[PDB]
Amino acid sequence: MNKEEIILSAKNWMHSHFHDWSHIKRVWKLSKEIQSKEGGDLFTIELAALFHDYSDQEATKTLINWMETKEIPSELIKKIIRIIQSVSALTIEEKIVQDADRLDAIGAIGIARTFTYGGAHNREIANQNPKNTTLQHFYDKLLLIKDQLNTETAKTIAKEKQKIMQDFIQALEKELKVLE
Amino acid sequence: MNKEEIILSAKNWMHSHFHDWSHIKRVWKLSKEIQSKEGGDLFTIELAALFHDYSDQEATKTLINWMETKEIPSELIKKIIRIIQSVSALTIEEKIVQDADRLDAIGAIGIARTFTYGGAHNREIANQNPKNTTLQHFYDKLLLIKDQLNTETAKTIAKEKQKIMQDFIQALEKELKVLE
Ligand SMILES: [Mg+2]
Ligand SMILES: [Mg+2]
């Protein structure tokens, strides 16, 4: 099996099947970056990352098929699938991908993504008088993600993100009541 | 006519009729703040601000009615309506309200509002390879608003906003391609 080629194929396959594709390719780039400092089977990581968002049980069986057809030892297929499960006792590969996923939920992308999501489920931006307001989602989940990360590399590439997010929030609650 | 009371009534009427109510009350608070430094008929401003978002020709005729019923000289009704038109040769009152409206389109609120809007019209967050991406809306309109403002007071209460917005954008385009 030619790893470089298989990756390329998987990449082109997911692309012509798509949040959007932009999201996947980010989790892919992100997990790639993380491994270069946390180690692990890069090939096993790169695919789990690219397929982490396809399972939404036939879909799963479809991937296995596509993978057996590529002649990937059934041992790798097993790991790759096990990883996808811990995403959407953890091996580093399962940690990396899961970290790369969470990382794309916070920071500037997080803000944009979470507010775009709210705009498709009628979730009030905020509400001083906060049970389901998007703003509260930042205090309940988002802001907490940065710490739940299970990788130091992931944690440092989360720093700049956890910052702008913090600044964004401060600025929101401030101009959300008009203070001056 | 009791101005303080009429304002209260208009306030309670728009409230039980609602972007959401949060938006109107902000444009109201915002225009109030601005006038305290730019002058103008506060009463004429306060109502145009509260009704600036109701015209969406019967609606217009409904307001006039509600206003004549409050015994507001037909001269004020005229101005108040003229203002609402320049919002959704400009007197300062028309400038203030229009400034207060634009102000709520940028800054943290802007980001949140524009991304929530995109999430209800399927507007891709961004796209490096930008004709309709929400990101581009920042370069085409939003970022430009801060300068189109026709009031110095408005311009300074736009400073903090134009900043976080600038920071947010920088941070977006940066983590949108994963740079490190
Ligand atoms: Mg995902
Ligand atoms: Mg408005």
CATH code of the domain covering residue B24: 1.10.472.50
B145 in A contact zone (CB under 8 Å): no
CA of A133 to the centre of ligand 1 (A): 22
SS3 of A171, please?
helix
Taking an 8 Å cut-off on Cβ atoms, the answer to whether A178 and B29 are in contact is yes
Which helix (H) or strand (E) is B113 found in, with range?
helix B107-118
Tokens encoding B62: 């409904």
Among all ligands shown, which has an atom nearest to the Cα of A22? 1
Taking an 8 Å cut-off on Cβ atoms, the answer to whether A168 and B134 are in contact is no
Q: Quick one: closest CA in B to A28, which residue? A: B178
Q: Which of A22, A23, A28 is nearest to A10 (CA)?
A: A28
Size of interface A-B (CB pairs under 8 A): 111
Sign of CA dihedral B20, B24, B27, B32: negative
Answer yes or no: do A6 and A83 share one domain: yes
What residues have their beta carbon closer than 5 A to ion ligand 1? A 53, 101
Instruction: Point out the residue among A19, A20, A119 whose CB comes nearest to the CB of B116.
Output: A119
Number of alpha carbons in the 13 Å side-chain half-sphere of residue B153: 18
The reported resolution of this PDB entry, expressed in Å, is 3.0
Answer yes or no: do B179 and B94 share one domain: yes
Cα Rg of chain A (Å, integer)? 18
Residues A80 and A132: beta-carbon distance below 8 Å: no
Helix axes A42-51, A92-103, angle to 10 degrees: 40
CATH of the domain at B154: 1.20.58.1910
Answer yes or no: do B77 and B115 share one domain: no
Answer yes or no: do B127 and B138 share one domain: yes
Answer yes or no: do A68 and A104 share one domain: no
Q: Is A53 annotated as a binding residue?
A: yes
C-alpha to C-alpha distance for B32 and B49, rounded to whole angstroms: 9
Distance of CA B148 to the CA centre of its chain: 13
- The experimental technique used to determine this model is X-ray
A130 in B contact zone (CB under 8 Å): no
Among all ligands shown, which has an atom nearest to the Cα of B19? 2
Q: Which of B96, B94, B107, B78 is nearest to B27 (CA)?
A: B96
Answer yes or no: do A115 and A157 share one domain: yes
Using a CB-CB cut-off of 8 Å, the residues of chain A touching B38 are none
Answer yes or no: do B20 and B42 share one domain: yes
C-alpha to C-alpha distance for A161 and A157, rounded to whole angstroms: 7
C-alpha to C-alpha distance for B116 and A119, rounded to whole angstroms: 4
Q: Which of B20, B18, B30 is nearest to A133 (CA)?
A: B20
Residues B107 and B74: beta-carbon distance below 8 Å: no
Answer yes or no: do A113 and A48 share one domain: no
Instruction: Point out the residue among A108, A118, A126 whose CB comes nearest to the CB of B172.
Output: A108
Answer yes or no: do A69 and A81 share one domain: yes
Tokens encoding B169: 């954008």
Answer yes or no: do B123 and B151 share one domain: yes
Taking an 8 Å cut-off on Cβ atoms, the answer to whether B116 and A127 are in contact is no
Domain boundary among B50, B69, B87: B87
Using a CB-CB cut-off of 8 Å, the residues of chain A touching B176 are 22, 26, 108-109
Which helix (H) or strand (E) is B168 found in, with range?
helix B159-175
Answer yes or no: do A76 and A110 share one domain: no
CA of B146 to the centre of ligand 2 (A): 16
Domain boundary among B54, B87, B120: B87
Domain that holds residue A144: 88-180
Hey, which bits of chain A come out as E strands? none
Helix axes A159-175, A107-118, angle to 10 degrees: 50
Q: Quick one: closest CA in A to B115, which residue? A: A116
Q: Which residues in chain B are immediately followed by a break of C to N over 2.5 Å?
A: 18, 56, 88, 129
B156 in A contact zone (CB under 8 Å): no
Using a CB-CB cut-off of 8 Å, the residues of chain B touching A134 are 112, 116
Domain boundary among A53, A87, A121: A87
Contacts of residue A157, Cβ cutoff 8 Å, sequence gap at least 6: A30, A33, A34, A103, B180
CB environment B121-147: b (16+ within 10 A), e (fewer): eebbbbeeeeeebbbbbbeeebbebbe
C-alpha to C-alpha distance for A123 and B48, rounded to whole angstroms: 28
Number of alpha carbons in the 13 Å side-chain half-sphere of residue A107: 25
Answer yes or no: do B80 and B96 share one domain: no
* Total count of domains within chain B: 2
